[PDB]
Amino acid sequence: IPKDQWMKKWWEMKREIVGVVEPVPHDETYCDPASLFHVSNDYSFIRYYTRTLYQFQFQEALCQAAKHEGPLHKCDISNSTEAGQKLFNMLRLGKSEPWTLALENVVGAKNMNVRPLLNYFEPLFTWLKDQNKNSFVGWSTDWSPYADQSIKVRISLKSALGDKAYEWNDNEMYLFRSSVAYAMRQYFLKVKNQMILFGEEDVRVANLKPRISFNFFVTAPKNVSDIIPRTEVEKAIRMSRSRINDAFRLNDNSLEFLGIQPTLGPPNQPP
Amino acid sequence: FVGWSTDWSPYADQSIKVRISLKSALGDKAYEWNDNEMYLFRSSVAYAMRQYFLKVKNQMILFGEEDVRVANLKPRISFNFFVTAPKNVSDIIPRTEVEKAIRMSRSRINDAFRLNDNSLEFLGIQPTLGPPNQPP
Amino acid sequence: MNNAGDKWSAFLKEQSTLAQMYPLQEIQNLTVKLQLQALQQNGSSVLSEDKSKRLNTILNTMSTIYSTGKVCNPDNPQECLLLEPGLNEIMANSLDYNERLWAWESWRSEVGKQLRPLYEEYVVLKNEMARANHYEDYGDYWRGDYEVNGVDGYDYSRGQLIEDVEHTFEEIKPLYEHLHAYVRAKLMNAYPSYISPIGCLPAHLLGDMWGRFWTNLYSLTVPFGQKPNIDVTDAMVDQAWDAQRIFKEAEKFFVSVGLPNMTQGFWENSMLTDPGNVQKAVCHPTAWDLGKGDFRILMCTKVTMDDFLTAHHEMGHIQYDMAYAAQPFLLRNGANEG
Ligand SMILES: *[C@@H]1O[C@H](CO)[C@@H](O[C@@H]2O[C@H](CO)[C@@H](O[C@@H]3O[C@H](CO[C@H]4O[C@H](CO[C@H]5O[C@H](CO)[C@@H](O)[C@H](O)[C@@H]5O)[C@@H](O)[C@H](O[C@H]5O[C@H](CO)[C@@H](O)[C@H](O)[C@@H]5O)[C@@H]4O)[C@@H](O)[C@H](O[C@H]4O[C@H](CO)[C@@H](O)[C@H](O)[C@@H]4O)[C@@H]3O)[C@H](O)[C@H]2NC(C)=O)[C@H](O)[C@H]1NC(C)=O
Ligand SMILES: *[C@@H]1O[C@H](CO)[C@@H](O[C@@H]2O[C@H](CO)[C@@H](O[C@@H]3O[C@H](CO[C@H]4O[C@H](CO[C@H]5O[C@H](CO)[C@@H](O)[C@H](O)[C@@H]5O)[C@@H](O)[C@H](O[C@H]5O[C@H](CO)[C@@H](O)[C@H](O)[C@@H]5O)[C@@H]4O)[C@@H](O)[C@H](O[C@H]4O[C@H](CO)[C@@H](O)[C@H](O)[C@@H]4O)[C@@H]3O)[C@H](O)[C@H]2NC(C)=O)[C@H](O)[C@H]1NC(C)=O
Ligand SMILES: *[C@@H]1O[C@H](CO)[C@@H](O[C@@H]2O[C@H](CO)[C@@H](O)[C@H](O)[C@H]2NC(C)=O)[C@H](O)[C@H]1NC(C)=O
Numbered sequence A: 001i002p003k004d005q006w007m008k009k010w011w012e013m014k015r016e017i018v019g020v021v022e023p024v025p026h027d028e029t030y031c032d033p034a035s036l037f038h039v040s041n042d043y044s045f046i047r048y049y050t051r052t053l054y055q056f057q058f059q060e061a062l063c064q065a066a067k068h069e070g071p072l073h074k075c076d077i078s079n080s081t082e083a084g085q086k087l088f089n090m091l092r093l094g095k096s097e098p099w100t101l102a103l104e105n106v107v108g109a110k111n112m113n114v115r116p117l118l119n120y121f122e123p124l125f126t127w128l129k130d131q132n133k134n135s136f137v138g139w140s141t142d143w144s145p146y147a148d149q150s151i152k153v154r155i156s157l158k159s160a161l162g163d164k165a166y167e168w169n170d171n172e173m174y175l176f177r178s179s180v181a182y183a184m185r186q187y188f189l190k191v192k193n194q195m196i197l198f199g200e201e202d203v204r205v206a207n208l209k210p211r212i213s214f215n216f217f218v219t220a221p222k223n224v225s226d227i228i229p230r231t232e233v234e235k236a237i238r239m240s241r242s243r244i245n246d247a248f249r250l251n252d253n254s255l256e257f258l259g260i261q262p263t264l265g266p267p268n269q270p271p
Numbered sequence B: 001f002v003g004w005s006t007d008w009s010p011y012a013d014q015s016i017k018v019r020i021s022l023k024s025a026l027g028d029k030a031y032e033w034n035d036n037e038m039y040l041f042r043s044s045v046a047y048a049m050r051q052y053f054l055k056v057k058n059q060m061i062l063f064g065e066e067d068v069r070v071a072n073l074k075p076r077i078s079f080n081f082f083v084t085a086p087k088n089v090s091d092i093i094p095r096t097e098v099e100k101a102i103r104m105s106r107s108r109i110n111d112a113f114r115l116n117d118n119s120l121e122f123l124g125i126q127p128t129l130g131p132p133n134q135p136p
Numbered sequence C: 001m002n003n004a005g006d007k008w009s010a011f012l013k014e015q016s017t018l019a020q021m022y023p024l025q026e027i028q029n030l031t032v033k034l035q036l037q038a039l040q041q042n043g044s045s046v047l048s049e050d051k052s053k054r055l056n057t058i059l060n061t062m063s064t065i066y067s068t069g070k071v072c073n074p075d076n077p078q079e080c081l082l083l084e085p086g087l088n089e090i091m092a093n094s095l096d097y098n099e100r101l102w103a104w105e106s107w108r109s110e111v112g113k114q115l116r117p118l119y120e121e122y123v124v125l126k127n128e129m130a131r132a133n134h135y136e137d138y139g140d141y142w143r144g145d146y147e148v149n150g151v152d153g154y155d156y157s158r159g160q161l162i163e164d165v166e167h168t169f170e171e172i173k174p175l176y177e178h179l180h181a182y183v184r185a186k187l188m189n190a191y192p193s194y195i196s197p198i199g200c201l202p203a204h205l206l207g208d209m210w211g212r213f214w215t216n217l218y219s220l221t222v223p224f225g226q227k228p229n230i231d232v233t234d235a236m237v238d239q240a241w242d243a244q245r246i247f248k249e250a251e252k253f254f255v256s257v258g259l260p261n262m263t264q265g266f267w268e269n270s271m272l273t274d275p276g277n278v279q280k281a282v283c284h285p286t287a288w289d290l291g292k293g294d295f296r297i298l299m300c301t302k303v304t305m306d307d308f309l310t311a312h313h314e315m316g317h318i319q320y321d322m323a324y325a326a327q328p329f330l331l332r333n334g335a336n337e338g
């Protein structure tokens, strides 16, 4: 992971592994994982994962020596000397032997297994499956609470220009972001009388596709957590749409903002 | 000559002067040249530099609106700009490369401001009209 | 305590240098080789003096920044909320979307920004330290705690942990998806027009600051709220259960499975009850294995079912520590960290 792509990766992992999406966008200036105690104090965190499995691997094992018949969550290993001796055979071992051998002395396996956890939670898993008949299981890596403020742009270069059409590389994206920032500056200067220093880094762009159709949203100048509401962005685009069209030699049909529909103009009539 | 001038500098030989006449090319319906127009012009110049360095020298240089330094702004809208290194201000791009970059992407700069090659004069970059093709 | 810890650390460091006289290429005794591995790891002693002091400085700075992190009102900077008091209560009790979002964002903007530049240098320094000890990366050094070699069947490589964890997580995903769907459906009725039925959950609506635990969401996701949970806290009060007999009950439970009794000096040296205000002590339940058959428990035990379970948990640690008392001091620890 490059040093300038930590957070973008982190919130890309939470959206598809944990299924948790950030409420507001975070740039590279944030260090969200460092806000956790175990990250900022140099503690290995994989220990809390394996320990979650081992106990069940122990428990499901200890209920076999205790001769448990019902569900695993109702098991009690008390009054069972065989289970205690089986546990003690590994307890007395300490570090003198590899942990795999210690596991094989209780669970009979050399590698960590996750099946005991599923066996433990099966009575809950069946109920949850029965409780989600009409709801949608899973999640999508494309939705976010701030996606309601995004404006989608669709560009068709080879239709408005035909031949002699430039290619949409990163430089064209920089020019487009600069044009959007200029439009925001013009709107905030000519309407609200507020001098806001927008830049090309304050127009955040995602979901770039070969169609040249992306989603951009304009944030605060240095307060990325703050997003300009979509209504003001639409008003700004309407105010200075001709300049944006001229900057790319497009005319109101190959540069569609998908929510900002242009007005053709009244057909003036004779008397 | 006794004395000195507050307008000369050793790096002033790398400066490119831009002269803009809004009310002649557009007449009426002409926007005013405030700071936002200057930001747009600097962004266009940075885009032109990026295009030149990508399509010729095969070098990816991340220019920005802060790397096109502008001085001597006047009500005529005539200033002097020079393009520096992305984060090495002490380093100035030589004027020849800047002129080549402007020549390469002058149409885009003209379109961004609705000017046509006569109200946007770069004072050193003269455009070419085009050969008058002849019948047999 | 600082002097004792420094003397112990100096002794360990000077013995680590002496342990270099016996390379692993010739040791044939399994436990001797393992003890040599335990005492041979240079750790932070392999870096230069400047790098070591910089690493210690940045670690201490990060720890202090996390500890002293306070969210303050710009209107009145004098009043601030700390992490443990208040802010955790805000994240675990409030049902207001805006308040939870403010708490989450303020905590992750006041502490994370101050920790990003320090963490960037911490990563590089740890990578350099790991590479100085013939490790590809510091994460590999972390994973080395599960390394097993030269057993002919029980061997475990450091790179095997990653693939094993990845394989195991894909078998939990089917259950986690259903649990997440149920949690989202139940939260839909508590925070309307914010939880999409098709997307994920916002990070600030998981009952806790970081989402590490969903326990505080239980009140918002109880399956059958009309049926009370199994609670026996009042029953112990009716029978007058002090914090002296619950440990006896735990001991009886332990001995019911064949595990040995408690030590004679364990009860006398223990602090099973809070010393009040006259004596200042800690309250985190901890087990202590001082050595020479000295096992003790520190716990400000109240009269609660959770206290009973915590007492059982601590007695578990005590029993585990007692089990390997005959092992050499370097091997007086669990098989691994979990
Ligand atoms: C970058 O941008 C971000 C935004 O993206 C910005 O962060 C915001 O900063 C502001 C200012 O500090 C925060 O607003 C503060 O909120 C504090 C928390 O208490 C309130 O939290 C909720 C806020 O809702 C407000 O608006 C709604 C709708 O208008 C209104 O109903 C609320 O009353 C409130 O005004 C709110 O839900 C919450 O509600 C309480 O009461 C209900 C009962 O009504 C109860 O059910 C709840 O459980 C809860 O107890 C509560 O009102 C708040 O303390 C704070 O107010 C103090 O400070 C201001 C000055 O800051 C004083 O004027 C005021 O008198 C108080 O002393 C203030 O309201 C906002 O939450 C942040 N948002 C985010 C997302 O972070 C950053 O500052 C920007 N940074 C930079 C550098 O620019
Ligand atoms: C941001 O941009 C700035 C530029 O704006 C940049 O700063 C430059 O960095 C370079 C690289 O370090 C500097 O060049 C170094 O100069 C050192 C000084 O010794 C030399 O100084 C003069 C340099 O002239 C060079 O070019 C001319 C013309 O091409 C040529 O004739 C010279 O020989 C030389 O190559 C030079 O006049 C001077 O001359 C000596 O000898 C004559 C006799 O011939 C004698 O009369 C003089 O008195 C003098 O003794 C001398 O040659 C130099 O040490 C250094 O060379 C070492 O380092 C490079 C690598 O850096 C090795 O490759 C090399 O083998 C040597 O080990 C190098 O030549 C340049 O001067 C800087 N300019 C400015 C304005 O600062 C920043 O680095 C940029 N920063 C970032 C972050 O990007
Ligand atoms: C590895 O060395 C240990 C320590 O010497 C051996 O364990 C026994 O330890 C006791 C106490 O130190 C000694 O009195 C014994 O002589 C040691 N050996 C035996 C067989 O009891 C251990 O046996 C050695 N391992 C091997 C494979 O030789």
Ligand SMILES: *[C@@H]1O[C@H](CO)[C@@H](O)[C@H](O)[C@H]1NC(C)=O
Pocket (backbone or CB within 6 Å): C020, C040, C041, C042, C046
């Ligand atoms: C520890 O460092 C010393 C030098 O300081 C080096 O000789 C040795 O190989 C390193 N590793 C071990 C395991 O001793």
Ligand SMILES: *[C@@H]1O[C@H](CO)[C@@H](O)[C@H](O)[C@H]1NC(C)=O
Pocket (backbone or CB within 6 Å): C255, C261, C262
């Ligand atoms: C453990 O000790 C208590 C008294 O300290 C004693 O009553 C009890 O019988 C002992 N346990 C066993 C199994 O004998």
Ligand SMILES: *[C@H]1O[C@H](CO)[C@@H](O)[C@H](O)[C@H]1NC(C)=O
Pocket (backbone or CB within 6 Å): A262, A263, A264, A265, A266
């Ligand atoms: C279209 O109509 C809108 C308002 O109805 C107006 O602002 C805009 O200038 C019009 N565009 C034309 C006439 O080209």
Ligand SMILES: *[C@H]1O[C@H](CO)[C@@H](O)[C@H](O)[C@H]1NC(C)=O
Pocket (backbone or CB within 6 Å): B127, B128, B129, B130, B131
């Ligand atoms: C003018 O001529 C130059 C080279 O002589 C050429 O690059 C440029 O495209 C021409 N411009 C026209 C024909 O508009």
